[PDB]
Automatic annotation (TrEMBL), chains A, B:
Superkingdom, natural source: Bacteria
Keyword DNA-binding: yes
A GO molecular function held by the record: DNA binding
Protein name as it appears in the record: CmeR
Length: 200, 200
């Protein structure tokens, strides 16, 4: 179908963009580099891919959606659902995702944009709030028959993700600190889940 | 004294460096810009100020020391010392420090260095571990007559600072999200202190 060829073309451009970002580097790579190796698979006209930044964020679109459904699945595998084991299932999947080299590579690209005057990032984050994983946790907190947990649901979701992610991701990104292996992941999630549920 | 003039000279160069960073911008500013308006108050020779990055991190040296002693004082004002009120005194001072425009401006400079091949940042962080504020909390946790708190002291210190700082600072820095006013600060610290001490 024409629509399928359209989508196949978009995917070729994104893969080319990503490959350049990884080999040549995000800052080194220009739009014309991407048009160049996309060939005539990109005709300058019909695109919403109007820039290097726009393409990066189209790639991020997909990755966010992919991570969301993966975390959601792992979490909804548990039907029984104590808060402790839902936290723990969310935690394990979330932290694993942040301990891949990819998470660091993308992290660096985003950090490097701190002085961008086009505000692609702010627009992206504001237009995609519903696609972030913390929403998954937020939904469970609501379901909890607890005054405190329903009313603070979003902030608790965000608190939990933060305790898991930081400052480890920040250090992976800024000074390329070592990732956590599987065991350390497990340990950190459990450590965090206890403090969160039961306090020190 | 010669030693006092030496120090006065160093301070002039740092103030010039900082002023440029704030008005012209960190990336826009070059070492020669700094030498330029430092005048002959900088003779190229005796300095350890061998670069724009080195100067930035000399400025950061002072700021870190200043924040450390300020938090330490506010914390040691309390002699009575329940864990709750020591956490709360550390929290209020810490979060206030991160909700100043300065914290954001410096944050952006650091983030922008993510692709620096000189690794000034990693060296700086590794050489100044003892000067970070989390050490203050770490010391209290040790003093607590608690097996769990003494053995995890550093990680608990780092956990607490993180729950306070993130992801708010990250968003101030990346997309210039609004700072918390005094009331929101107070609210967040208390919110966080409860979860930390007592769990949800
Ligand atoms: C800026 C970070 C803050 C997280 C967030 O957006 N929380 C919202 C809090 S709030 O209720 O609106 O206050 C997140 C948001 C989007 C994140 C990035 C997108 O997630 C990019 C991905 C790649 C993925 O595997 C997820 C991690 C990551 C490599 C992210 C790193 C980064 O620190 C970002 C920018
Ligand atoms: C990278 C951040 C992580 C904090 C940290 O170093 N924790 C150590 C954890 S661990 O036990 O070694 O694992 C911190 C460390 C030094 C921090 C920067 C220095 O603090 C620069 C200052 C300016 C000050 O007012 C403090 C905040 C800040 C504007 C910082 C922002 C930033 O996110 C940094 C880089």
């Amino acid at each position: 179908t024409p629509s399928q060829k359209v989508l196949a073309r978009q995917e070729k451009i994104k893969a080319v963009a990503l490959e350049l970002f990884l080999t040549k580097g995000y800052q080194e790579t220009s739009l014309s580099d991407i048009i160049k190796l996309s060939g005539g698979s990109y005709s300058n006209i019909y695109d919403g891919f109007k820039s290097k930044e726009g393409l990066f964020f189209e790639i991020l679109d997909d990755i966010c959606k992919k991570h969301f459904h993966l975390i959601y699945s792992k979490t909804q595998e548990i039907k029984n659902g104590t808060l402790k084991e839902i936290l723990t299932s969310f935690g394990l999947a979330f932290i694993e995702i942040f301990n891949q080299p990819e998470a660091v590579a993308f992290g660096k690209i985003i950090y490097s944009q701190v002085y961008d005057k086009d505000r692609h990032l702010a627009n992206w984050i504001e237009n995609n709030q519903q696609n972030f994983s913390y929403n998954i946790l937020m939904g469970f907190f609501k379901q909890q028959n607890n005054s405190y947990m329903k009313k603070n649901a979003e902030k608790l979701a965000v608190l939990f993700c933060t305790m898991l992610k930081e400052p480890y991701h920040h250090l992976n990104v800024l000074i390329n600190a070592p990732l956590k292996n599987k065991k350390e992941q497990k340990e950190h999630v459990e450590f965090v889940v206890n403090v969160f549920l039961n306090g020190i």
